[PDB]
């Protein structure tokens, strides 16, 4: 009795083909910038999830966003900084600018590029079918890039997507749970907010990969097209799989449990029991029908699969018909 090993379908050994220092964050020596160069303007309010500030970098007068990280392990701080530096410049990924410690708290602070405060959460339930397609493809750009750079985000959810309303500039943020993918590495199942936890985390399948981000994105998509926030509404980690099972059916769940020989608690197995597969047309109602099309259902169907290996890659996702017209967007800004 033992869980079978798994491998990522794409970008499998990207980190291996790179030098050690690219992914060996525990050896990274953190370069510090001057605190006296940054002055905080106003508390930008991450909804009391974190300490986010507007700040002026006085040495160049430019505006910066400063986040003071809640006191975590030295290991996890090293990770994020190395991840952000490596990902710097990529499409729709927050640009890290400086690393500073606060003198009145001894707490590390991250400095980011110009950001206007609009959380995707309070927007994604009121947007056109076209703009759902537009921003989804923008997120994919970030995820395809960061996966190719050997990094799983591990907290894909609308609260961690920031959108500049007026410029339509989308930045994927919150890389505090992000981790370098290495073939054959066991990863923590504690990552990701429950509503966006993939089946792999929910069954304790520990050798998952980038394909985790794609499930979460499927949950985000499901939320937008059906106007159900959130789509899978688990009141419990166990109930989260129940809510999933009541939609995709239990059959394919037991294929997934069998395939990778995952040992699931026979008591949890009892509660899961037998649920039939539901077609998405049953989530369709008057309010959301205009936000739903066959290509939307097809894409989502190819994201919300139990078997992580059978979910679309970020690249395969960017080539789906669902985004066919939106790739030709004419960047109208009013
Ligand atoms: Cl962030
Ligand atoms: Cl692996
Ligand atoms: Cl990918």
SS3 of 225-241: the string is: HHCCCCCCCCCCHHHHH
Residues 172/92, Cβ–Cβ less than 8 Å = yes
Q: Which residues, 6 or more positions from 123, have their beta carbon under 8 angstroms from its beta carbon?
A: 163, 165
Residues 223/231, Cβ–Cβ less than 8 Å = yes
The encoded tokens of residue 252 equal: 């394919």
User: How much distance in Å is there from the Cα of 152 to the middle of ligand 3?
Assistant: 9
> How far, in Å, are 21, 80, 248 from residue 276 at the CA level?
49, 41, 7
| Nearest in space to 162 (alpha carbons), one of 196, 113, 210 | 113
The encoded tokens of residue 94 equal: 């927050």
> How far, in Å, are 68, 115, 277 from residue 54 at the CA level?
11, 9, 48
Please report, to the nearest 10 degrees, the dihedral formed by the alpha carbons of residues 120, 124, 127, 132 taken in order: 90
Residues 135/120, Cβ–Cβ less than 8 Å = yes
Residue 98, phi then psi, degrees to nearest 5:
-155, 160
> How far, in Å, are 56, 103, 108, 258, 294 from residue 36 at the CA level?
11, 10, 14, 58, 55
295/312 Cα distance (integer angstroms): 14
- Tell me how far apart the terminal alpha carbons of the chain are, to the nearest angstrom: 60
> How far, in Å, are 130, 131, 174, 214 from residue 122 at the CA level?
17, 14, 17, 22
Residue 193 annotated as part of some ligand binding site: no
User: How much distance in Å is there from the Cα of 93 to the middle of ligand 1?
Assistant: 9
The encoded tokens of residue 115 equal: 């950001």
The encoded tokens of residue 298 equal: 């097809």
Widest CA span in the chain: 64
Question: Strand, helix or coil at 144?
Answer: helix
Q: Is 144 a catalytic residue?
A: no
User: How much distance in Å is there from the Cα of 92 to the middle of ligand 3?
Assistant: 15
The encoded tokens of residue 286 equal: 């008057």
Q: Which ligand is nearest to the CA of 209?
A: 2
41: left (phi over 0), alpha (psi -120 to 50) or beta: alpha
Question: Strand, helix or coil at 156?
Answer: coil
Q: What angle do CA 147, 148, 154 make, to 5 degrees?
A: 10
Residue 50 annotated as part of some ligand binding site: yes
59/196 Cα distance (integer angstroms): 41
Helices marked H in 120-175: 129-148
Residues 109/68, Cβ–Cβ less than 8 Å = yes
Q: Which of 37, 129, 131, 155 is catalytic?
A: 155
Q: Which ligand is nearest to the CA of 179?
A: 2
What domains can be seen in the chain, in order of their start residue? 6-23+115-330 (1.10.510.10), 24-114 (3.30.200.20)
Q: Which ligand is nearest to the CA of 3?
A: 2
Place of tokens 């890389």: 175
Experimental method for this entry? Answer: X-ray
| Nearest in space to 131 (alpha carbons), one of 163, 157, 160 | 163
The encoded tokens of residue 10 equal: 């794409």
The encoded tokens of residue 313 equal: 């890659």
296/326 Cα distance (integer angstroms): 13
Residue 49 annotated as part of some ligand binding site: yes
Residue 45 annotated as part of some ligand binding site: yes
User: How much distance in Å is there from the Cα of 145 to the middle of ligand 3?
Assistant: 8
Place of tokens 């991840």: 83
Alpha carbon of residue 212 to chain centroid: 8
SS3 of 64-88: the string is: EEEEECCCCCHHHHHHHHHHHHHHC
Q: Strands, DSSP E only, in the chain? A: 38-43, 51-57, 63-68, 96-101, 108-112, 151-152, 161-164, 169-172, 179-180
Residue 101 annotated as part of some ligand binding site: no
71/313 Cα distance (integer angstroms): 34
| Nearest in space to 178 (alpha carbons), one of 84, 89, 259 | 84
Q: What angle do CA 277, 216, 141 make, to 5 degrees?
A: 125
Q: How many CB atoms lie within 10 A of CB 158?
A: 24
User: How much distance in Å is there from the Cα of 117 to the middle of ligand 3?
Assistant: 28
- List 282's β-bridge partners, or say none: none
């Amino acid at each position: 009795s033992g869980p079978v090993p798994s491998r990522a379908r794409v970008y499998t050994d990207v980190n291996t083909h790179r030098p050690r220092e690219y992914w060996d964050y525990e050896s990274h020596v953190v370069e510090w910038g001057n605190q006296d160069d940054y002055q905080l303007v106003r508390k930008l309010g991450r909804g009391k999830y974190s300490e986010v500030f507007e700040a002026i970098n006085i040495t160049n007068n430019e505006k910066v966003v400063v986040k003071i990280l809640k006191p975590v392990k030295k290991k996890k701080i090293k990770r994020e900084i190395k991840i952000l530096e490596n990902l710097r410049g990529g499409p729709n990924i927050i640009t890290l600018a400086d690393i500073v410690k606060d003198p009145v708290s001894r707490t590390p602070a991250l400095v980011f590029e110009h950001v206007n405060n609009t959380d995707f959460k309070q927007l994604y339930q009121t947007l056109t079918d076209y703009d759902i397609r537009f921003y989804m493809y923008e997120i994919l750009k970030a995820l395809d890039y960061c996966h190719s750079m050997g990094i799983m985000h591990r907290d894909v959810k609308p609260h961690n997507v920031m959108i500049d309303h007026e410029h339509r500039k989308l930045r994927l943020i919150d890389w505090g749970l992000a981790e370098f993918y290495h073939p054959g590495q066991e990863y923590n199942v504690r990552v990701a907010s429950r509503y966006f936890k993939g089946p792999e985390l929910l069954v304790d399948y520990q050798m998952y990969d980038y394909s985790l981000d794609m499930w979460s994105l499927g949950c985000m998509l499901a939320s937008m097209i059906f106007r159900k926030e959130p789509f899978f509404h688990g009141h419990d980690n166990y109930d989260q799989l129940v809510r999933i099972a009541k939609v995709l059916g239990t059959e394919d769940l037991y294929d997934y449990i069998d395939k990778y020989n995952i040992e699931l608690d026979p008591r949890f197995n009892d509660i899961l029991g037998r649920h039939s597969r539901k077609r998405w047309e049953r989530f369709v109602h008057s309010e959301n029908q205009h936000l739903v099309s066959p290509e939307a259902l097809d894409f989502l169907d190819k994201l919300l699969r139990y078997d992580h290996q059978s979910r679309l890659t970020a690249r395969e996702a960017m080539e789906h018909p669902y985004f066919y017209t939106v790739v030709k967007d004419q960047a109208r800004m009013g």
